[PDB]
């Protein structure tokens, strides 16, 4: 009952599960990138991204918080806030 | 495609189908903004009187003390004896009491007559 986590490892895992998705290119997928502006997905696909990573990490984020992610850096930051990733 | 979800004293109406959140008035949005302003000011002064390291003790909620003194001390004033209060007082103070009274006299008279004859289970009835 002690899963280890690290910031770079969970960053690479979130980047990996973003790269698994179809309509964004695996070539140009930044750590620091917008969602609505440059990646070419709407609000609906963005919340589908949210739903899939909720289903993988086992804890939801609310719609009162789902307005305001917009970039994977804050995603890694918020999930690190939930997990409190230090030794 | 449904019986439209009747509300009741247990049937809590969920916030999806209100349906008063459809024809929203602009003054109702203004009321929501005033509600946000009230909660904003109250949580602001909570975080003022809450995060002080110089402060030591409790938060001193005025509203909870207000509710408690309303619930305990503010009962007997105000009051007037109305029709509903007097009727409900006679219904909850006298009714079930006289109900148990008559059934206890009835069962006691049954027991009294059945032991007055002598055809009881007193073959051994030690612990009275």
């Amino acid at each position: 009952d002690a899963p280890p986590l690290t910031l770079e490892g969970i960053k690479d895992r979130v980047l990996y599960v973003l790269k698994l998705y179809d309509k964004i290119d695996p070539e140009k997928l930044s750590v620091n990138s917008h969602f609505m502006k440059d990646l070419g997905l709407d609000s609906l696909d963005q919340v589908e991204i949210i739903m899939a990573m909720e289903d993988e990490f086992g804890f939801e984020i609310p719609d009162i918080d789902a307005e305001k992610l917009m970039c994977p850096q804050e995603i890694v930051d918020y999930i690190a806030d939930k997990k409190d990733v230090y030794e | 495609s449904f019986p439209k979800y009747e509300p009741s004293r247990l049937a809590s109406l969920p916030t999806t189908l209100d349906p008063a959140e459809y024809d929203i008035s602009s003054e109702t949005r203004k009321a929501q903004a005033e509600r946000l302003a009230i909660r904003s000011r109250l949580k602001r002064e909570y975080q003022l009187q809450y995060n002080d390291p110089s402060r030591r003790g409790v938060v001193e909620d005025p509203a909870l003390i207000r509710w408690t003194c309303a619930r305990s001390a503010n009962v007997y004033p105000n009051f007037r004896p109305n029709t509903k209060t007097s009727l409900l007082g006679a219904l909850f103070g006298i009714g079930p009491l006289i109900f148990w009274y008559y059934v206890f006299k009835t069962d006691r008279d049954r027991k009294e007559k059945l032991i007055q004859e002598g055809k009881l289970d007193r073959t051994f009835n030690i612990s009275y």
Partner: protein, 459 residues
């Protein structure tokens, strides 16, 4: 027994000619020596009751209550500091001497020869407690609480005196054996009804019964800890003892006239168990709990079975210990937070962790813990009332269920689930608190081993 009376007189000027930081040691040490002296008492054997003096005597029903009183005194004097410890030494000596004088009148009350002497010591039991709770009630309506207190008890207890002078002037002297050994069945006139109703009505006020109950909870929520524990335990179980003594007379008419008192007793037991399930202001919950348990006592007294009397006196002693404990629990949380509310102060599963077991055991004894004295007393009460009536068990079991429910809710309201994260001042558990706890609950379970003392005169 005057060998037990006169050192209590000698302890009265002890606080006066004790110096500073020496009142505590002298009072506590010498009152615990009085506790050994109190445990020496039980020489009583078998058939009759023992006589101590030209004046008075000890019954087998007086002795456990005298033990309870002289055992509750040092616990209480140990209890009632630190909320008056910032005030003056002369006023502290006044308070200690007032408690010792109160104890002395209580011992005269329990060990009475005659019911006139019992009446003198009855209102002497009343009066200094009101001075105590009025001078240190520490809440704004202590005035109205004491006013209600003395008016209800002196108004209910007034015709008792005239009825006792009537029993004097028509039957000779009032000493319990010659008051006994001579009685006659007094027929269904009205004078028997009024005299019976006067004496029983005075003690109905003293229990209290349901229709005159609001006497009690204001005098608990607006009293300090010493007057509250003495008030509940000693005063209400003293009224029960007084009814147990006086009820030897007027047995042929009490069958005709004793039905509606049973009625108000049972139905008010139900409604009082109902009222102390929802309320906040935790201090009131013990008071309405005491109303419930003494209504159960009153049902057990007006049914006239030896089973009933033994169960009633066991319930008396057990609930006295229980209510004094739970008063001390409420004062512990009040020393932690100056709130007196219930829904505010929460948490304390982590904080003060072994106090949780004491709160557990308190809700267990009000929950009728199944080897406790409380359950044994209520069990004999339920057995005797079902022998008296084959139909009464609905109200008894509903009292049992709701009693369990409000005792458990009283447990899990303030000390279950989550810290409120704004208290952020409280200190860990003191030595004195759990010391008072060990003084409460060890003799209760050690009586739960061998309860041969705590049953009635027909043991």
């Amino acid at each position: 027994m005057l060998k037990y009376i006169i050192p209590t007189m000698m302890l009265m000027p002890l606080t006066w000619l004790s110096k500073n930081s020496m009142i505590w040691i002298n009072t506590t040490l010498h009152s615990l020596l009085i506790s050994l002296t109190s445990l020496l008492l039980l020489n009583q054997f078998g058939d009759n009751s023992l006589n101590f003096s030209l004046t008075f005597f000890s019954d087998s029903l007086s002795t456990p209550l005298l033990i309870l009183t002289m055992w509750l005194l040092p616990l209480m004097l140990m209890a009632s500091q630190h909320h008056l410890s910032k005030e003056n030494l002369a006023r502290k000596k006044l308070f200690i001497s007032m408690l010792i004088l109160l104890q002395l009148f209580l011992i005269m009350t329990f060990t009475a020869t005659e019911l006139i002497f019992f009446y003198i010591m009855f209102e002497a039991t009343l009066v200094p407690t009101l001075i105590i709770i009025t001078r240190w009630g520490n809440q704004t309506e202590r005035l109205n609480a004491g006013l209600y207190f003395l008016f209800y008890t002196l108004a209910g207890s007034l015709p008792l005196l005239v009825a006792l002078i009537y029993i004097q002037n028509t039957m000779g002297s009032l000493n319990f054996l010659i008051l006994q050994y001579w009685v006659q069945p007094m027929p269904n006139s009205w004078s028997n009804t009024f005299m019976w109703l006067a004496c029983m009505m005075a003690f109905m006020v003293k229990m209290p019964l349901y229709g005159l109950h609001l006497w009690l909870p204001k005098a608990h929520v607006e009293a300090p800890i010493a007057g509250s524990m003495v008030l509940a335990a000693i005063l209400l179980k003293l009224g029960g003892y007084g009814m147990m003594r006086i009820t030897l007379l007027l047995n042929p008419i009490t069958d005709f006239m004793a039905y509606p008192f049973i009625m108000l007793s049972l139905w008010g037991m139900i409604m009082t168990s109902s009222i102390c399930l929802r309320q906040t202001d935790l201090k009131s919950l013990i008071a309405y709990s005491s109303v419930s348990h003494m209504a159960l006592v009153i049902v057990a007294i007006l049914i006239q079975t030896p089973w009933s009397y033994m169960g009633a006196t066991a319930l008396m002693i057990a609930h006295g210990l229980t209510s004094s404990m739970l008063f001390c629990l409420a004062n512990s949380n009040y020393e932690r937070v100056h709130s007196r509310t219930m829904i505010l102060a929460r948490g304390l599963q982590t904080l003060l962790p072994l106090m949780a077991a004491w709160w557990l055991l308190a809700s267990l004894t009000n929950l009728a813990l199944p080897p406790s004295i409380n359950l044994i007393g209520e069990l004999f009460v339920v057995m005797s009332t079902f022998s008296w009536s084959n139909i009464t068990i609905i109200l008894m079991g509903l009292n049992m269920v709701i009693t369990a429910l409000y005792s458990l809710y009283m447990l899990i309201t303030t000390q279950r689930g989550k810290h409120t994260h704004h208290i952020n001042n409280i200190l860990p558990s003191f030595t004195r608190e759990n010391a008072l706890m060990s003084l409460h609950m060890l003799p209760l379970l050690l009586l739960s081993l061998n309860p041969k003392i705590i049953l009635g005169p027909l043991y």
